[PDB]
Design a protein. Structure first.
Lengths: 371, 371
């Protein structure tokens, strides 16, 4: 293969088991939206469920229907629904639906009537993120409509959910504030005669660093893939599951003073050897990594030199060579063999590892190492 | 949810513009990287129908996909990993550009196994120093090619090279590369080796340095309507890709309320927001957060707060609400309606429109407007 994103499913399993320890008695909902954060929703889902995950979480019904079509029968919740969505197929596929407005519930209820299928409903309430979540003023009317729907067996009231404002800052008081708001929302449900089976607020960071804020379920995403939910604390006993690597497509000598890639942005101070790596920014190698990233080849860090092109870039191998055409170069991974990490790319680019692992594509073929 | 709508009428227009600038020269439309994100097969079909004579791609794999999709026009591939079996290319009538003596031997080995004449182009280094045959090795290559031609093992179709900095067309390096390219043609003429065609020109050279046009031009970026010399304006081209999405939610917020992760934006005034259900896993670069604008019903609306994995918020302002759920937000396009361009994104995060248009993916479904 020209290049591959190898997902280690034994790393996934290990990370799920680590997360279950932090979750204690709370059930684990593994978040596999965005094609398993670029790792493959179905294969990751299967591994996580086998490692103790109780439920799966995705953004869209389409993501849940994809898992169902691959044979997944475990519970799946979807919480982002565009205007015009037909909830019918979700109901027929035993997909759980989180509603974030009265309009969305009314749309779900029309789908229940059309399909004859009771909806397993979760309500997504806003505790601070201010995105798609029922606002505090609208929550009582939401409870009222849910109770009436429940009283006619049109819905099963499964969940109350919300999402944390900080994905990596557990010490910030907004975490405590959101957990208090969530508790007051649960008290509002009580005064309106409504009980949810379960309530959940916690992402990877809250699960691992704020276990005092854990409700009935936890919803880890980033930590399942092994990426630290609080990078300032280290790897947190997790193992990043994705290793991006590619073959050395060409070894080229150059003389001191010669330029490389478009605009000749880098000149050779000494006679040396370069390796052409046949992936580039169309494959998810951020162009802004040019002249900053390093790759690991046969145990040594080799710096990128010159601009990253659409499907290739060059690294400096130095001046006799221990690298051959066809040898493997590691761009990032868990860091076990001394290679860069997804967090290293995030630091160089000014982003987060979430964006790094959803980047590889095109020439970078996704592959799996079994547990 | 969202789409990258490719206007094939724009493609047709751009190909016509490029043929006008190419004058007598035929056009090889460059459709690598799945048509720079616009769809290699659909763009190739359209470009051929507007008078492109040939197609260019990086890999044989890319060429074989075009062939599998029913493309019968000539296709040239110019980036091959070491140890490739050129058999499949030869059987599928894929032209092969060789960039080293070793690669030519790989090709002639495949000619011997298959019994099919190779239609060969020689890719020569005139200063890019990426791949390409150097002047030191070119005389030996000509001697070998003359011997393969004699036995009909190769048809000597093309000589090619690639410009280092043609988007700075006044730079002398362009003249220098063309003179080196001429020296290669001269070296072949004096050694009694004749190529059917020679081509040096990318989009920039084609549009801005017609004095450097040989027998063919090889435009990629301009076929997609993206300016090959941004500083000169649109150069009479029309960007073919419009990235747009449905407004998923409209909501009011109060002054002092934070939005999105980390509350990195605090509302300075009561205002209305729109939730746009695409994010960095869909190619909306996270670094655009708080910098980009979208167009909704003729008005520019700034992004506010962090861009999330699959959604971000825009500020509709406190004026009369003129946006509804279900309305269309344009992220970038040609600019005909006042929307931002791909170049605008490139300016904002410090890249080039090439990378912008190879980014949209995920929830951003590729769609086509017929000519
Ligand atoms: C409702 C809900 N519950 C749990 C998770 C999982 O959160 P993480 O454990 O931090 O991966 C997410 C994911 N949110 C993505 C991550 O990137 N930006 C986002 O908007 C989520 O929307
Ligand atoms: C041999 C050859 N010939 C023509 C074109 C067309 O280049 P353009 O007209 O600028 O789109 C390209 C593509 N040059 C690149 C731009 O970004 N990454 C690249 O590798 C090419 O490699
Ligand atoms: Ca409308
Ligand atoms: Cl390439
Ligand atoms: Cl989302």
């Amino acid at each position: 293969l020209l290049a591959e994103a190898m997902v280690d499913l034994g790393a996934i399993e290990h990370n799920v088991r680590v997360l279950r320890e932090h979750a204690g008695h709370a059930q684990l909902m593994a978040v596999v939206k965005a094609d398993g954060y670029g790792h493959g929703a179905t294969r990751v889902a299967q591994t996580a469920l086998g490692a103790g995950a109780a439920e799966l979480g995705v953004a869209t019904v389409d993501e849940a229907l994809a898992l169902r079509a691959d044979g997944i029968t475990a519970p799946v919740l979807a919480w982002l629904h565009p205007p015009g969505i037909d909830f019918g197929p979700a109901l027929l596929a035993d997909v759980q639906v989180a509603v974030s407005s009265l309009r969305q519930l009314d749309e779900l209820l029309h789908a229940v009537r059309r399909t004859g299928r009771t909806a397993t409903v979760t309500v997504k309430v806003d505790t601070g993120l201010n995105r798609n979540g029922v606002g505090p003023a609208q929550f009582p009317a939401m409870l009222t409509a849910l109770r009436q729907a429940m009283a006619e067996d049109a819905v099963r009231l499964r969940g109350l959910m919300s999402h944390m404002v900080y994905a990596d800052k557990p010490d910030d008081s907004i975490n405590d504030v959101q957990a208090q708001r969530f508790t007051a929302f649960l008290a509002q449900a009580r005064e309106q005669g409504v009980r949810f089976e379960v309530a959940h607020l916690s992402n990877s960071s809250a699960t691992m660093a704020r276990p005092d804020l854990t409700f009935d379920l936890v919803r880890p995403g980033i930590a399942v893939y092994g990426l630290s939910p609080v990078p300032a604390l280290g790897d947190m006993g997790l193992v990043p599951a994705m290793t991006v690597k590619c073959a050395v497509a060409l070894v080229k000598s150059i003389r001191a003073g010669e330029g490389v890639s478009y605009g000749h942005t880098w000149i050779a101070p000494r006679d040396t050897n370069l390796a052409l790596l046949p992936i580039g920014y169309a494959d998810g190698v951020f162009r802004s990594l040019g002249g900053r990233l390093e790759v690991l080849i046969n145990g040594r860090r080799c710096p990128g030199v010159g601009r990253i092109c659409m499907n290739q870039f060059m690294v400096d191998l130095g001046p006799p060579l221990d690298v051959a055409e066809g040898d493997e170069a590691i761009l990032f991974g868990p860091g076990i063999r001394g290679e860069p990490t997804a967090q290293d790319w995030a630091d160089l680019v000014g982003t987060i590892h979430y964006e790094v692992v959803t980047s590889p594509r095109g020439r970078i073929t996704r592959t799996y190492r079994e547990a």
